[PDB]
Write a protein that binds this ligand. Structure first.
Ligand code: 19H
Ligand SMILES: OC[C@H]1O[C@H](O[C@H]2[C@H](O)[C@@H](O)[C@@H](O)O[C@@H]2CO)[C@H](O)[C@@H](O)[C@@H]1O
Ligand code: MG
Ligand code: MG
Ligand code: NA
Length: 516
């Protein structure tokens, strides 16, 4: 392996208490003589899967739980095995946030929700509604102050307002419906339009980012910001007289933050998995370990029952959990990163005027839907090609698109498979695909062949058509069970390598129109 044996390398994001975490590492080091190194890499959430995909990287990775499903799907995480006694030390819903396909894939650390943070000296009674913020900004501007500044470059911070009047990511009612995406519905449009109107009317600036908003609040220039518990330390230092409270309502509805559980995963490629377990269970997830990190930058409502009993007495934590209860724990489906990228682009483009709100959110909808919709089309095609019989089940949400895409794929794919039969036979013989482990190795090959050159729908049909050819083969040799992981692999390659192009074509609607 590439990861060094007999030491621990730990990666955590730069807005967390990494010096406090390093103190916990030093205690581990003192006991054992084993080196512990804490780093906070730039763009951590993208750097980790890049390096781990090659069998490299840190032993332990920290992030909110939403990204861990994708990491697990990609084989980048070890299944964790806490014993019953340890599990019973943390709240059950925090374990729920780090369960993926029935397996625990990380240790939960703390519950994060955004709150409204306000300067009591400027704004002793913070607004209950978003709607009153323009007038409040006018009053404050007369005094050389602004009402509100927060990070407009990460959709995490704008999401609560988008979700307020009915925007949603993937439909949840008790039960998910991942095919059902609510990124460009009327509620989402209303929320984002209100945000863009704030910018148009000079109550906010589209360029405001994390550092700019934090500095303005901590210098006493803006009366409000929106942030999580990690931000409280720097406000303490600034000596601003601040409060932490419920987010404003929009159209009478609560703002609904996406709630994260800061979690610690173990690299699948680590030769130090037992060391990592010992560190996390016996050093970090203890009253003294969490206090060391919390004293650096507050964690929020921690997963460890014994310590949370103390933290819960803090009105700032009470406010954190009040906001959390009005929001929703993030999914950890593997396309969460694509959802976030899609909405990130929509907010930035709407705020800058590069797109209208309507067209921005339409693109984010398509981007968010891409994986599940492509998988439905591709899986159905590969299966009916293997067996000869079509799936009689209803398509579900966006069913017309999925149905017409499959119809188009059948028609165009028939010609492609006929004309490419000799080429496909040759490639199949060269690849020698015998089983599920062989199928798992195909992703790298696909990416190599499919990434280079101009993208068009014909090439995408050839990708999927060779998939169907391989699926027929797998069926013939009594490996029919391999067809679904084959479809998942092809889908992953398609939507990752051609994301921007696919959104530009309006996804599968463009496919249907191109070949009408
Ligand atoms: C399911 C699967 C699909 C693949 O498609 C690669 C991109 C489409 C393609 C191209 C292309 O990108 O132009 N050329 C091919 C030649 C053959 Cl014989 C088969 C496929 C193509 C390639 C592989 C290795 C696998 Cl396993
Ligand atoms: O903005 C999209 C982003 O949102 C969340 O990231 C949060 C993170 O959970 C917090 O701990 C803190 O670091 O702020 C981040 C926002 O800048 C998701 O967890 C993340 O995956 C997503 O990209
Ligand atoms: Mg568009
Ligand atoms: Mg649609
Ligand atoms: Na007052």
């Amino acid at each position: 392996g590439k990861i060094e044996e007999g030491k621990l390398v730990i990666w955590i994001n730069g807005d967390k208490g990494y010096n406090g975490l390093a103190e916990v590492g030093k205690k581990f080091e003192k006991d054992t003589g084993i080196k512990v190194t804490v780093e906070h890499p730039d763009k951590l959430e993208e750097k980790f899967p890049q390096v781990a995909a090659t069998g490299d990287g840190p032993d332990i990775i920290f992030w909110a739980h939403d990204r861990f499903g994708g990491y697990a799907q990609s084989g980048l995480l070890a299944e964790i095995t806490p014993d019953k006694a340890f599990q019973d030390k943390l709240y059950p819903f925090t374990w729920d946030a780090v369960r993926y396909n029935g397996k625990l894939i990380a240790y939960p650390i703390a519950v994060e929700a955004l709150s409204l943070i306000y300067n009591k000296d400027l704004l002793p009674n913070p607004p209950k509604t978003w709607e009153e913020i323009p007038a409040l900004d006018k009053e404050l501007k007369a005094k050389g102050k602004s009402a509100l500044m927060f990070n407009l470059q990460e959709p995490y911070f704008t999401w609560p307002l988008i979700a307020a009047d009915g925007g949603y990511a993937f439909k949840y009612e008790n039960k998910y419906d991942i095919k059902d995406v609510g990124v460009d519905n009327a509620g989402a449009k209303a929320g984002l339009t209100f945000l863009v109107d704030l910018i148009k009317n000079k109550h906010m600036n589209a360029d405001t980012d994390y550092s700019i908003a934090e500095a303005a609040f901590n210098k006493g220039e803006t009366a409000m910001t929106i942030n999580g518990p990690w931000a409280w330390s720097n406000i303490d230092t600034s000596k601003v007289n601040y409060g932490v409270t419920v987010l404003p309502t929009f159209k009478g509805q609560p703002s609904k933050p996406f709630v994260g559980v800061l979690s610690a995963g173990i690299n699948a490629a680590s030769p130090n998995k037992e060391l990592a377990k010992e560190f996390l269970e016996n050093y970090l997830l203890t009253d003294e370990g969490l206090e060391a990190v919390n004293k650096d930058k507050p964690l929020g409502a921690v997963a460890l029952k014994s310590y949370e009993e103390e933290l819960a007495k803090d009105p700032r934590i009470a406010a954190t959990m009040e906001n959390a209860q009005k929001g929703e724990i993030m999914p950890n489906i593997p396309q969460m990163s694509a959802f976030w990228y899609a909405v990130r682009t929509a907010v930035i483009n709407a705020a800058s005027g590069r797109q209208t709100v309507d067209e921005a959110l339409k693109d984010a909808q398509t981007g968010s839907e891409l994986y599940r919709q492509s998988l439905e089309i591709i899986s159905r095609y590969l299966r009916e090609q293997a067996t000869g019989a079509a799936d009689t089940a209803p398509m579900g949400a966006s069913g017309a698109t999925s149905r017409k895409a499959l119809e188009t794929l059948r028609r165009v794919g028939d010609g492609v498979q006929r004309n490419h039969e000799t080429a496909f036979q040759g490639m199949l013989r060269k690849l020698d695909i015998k089983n599920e482990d062989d199928v798992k190795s195909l992703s790298r090959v696909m990416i190599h062949v499919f990434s280079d050159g101009v993208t068009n729908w014909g090439r995408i049909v050839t990708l999927i058509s060779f998939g169907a050819f391989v699926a027929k083969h797998l069926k013939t040799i009594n490996q029919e069970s391999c067809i679904e992981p084959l479809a998942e692999s092809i889908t992953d390659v398609l939507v990752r390598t051609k994301r921007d192009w696919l959104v530009k074509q309006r996804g599968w609607d463009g496919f249907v129109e191109f070949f009408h």
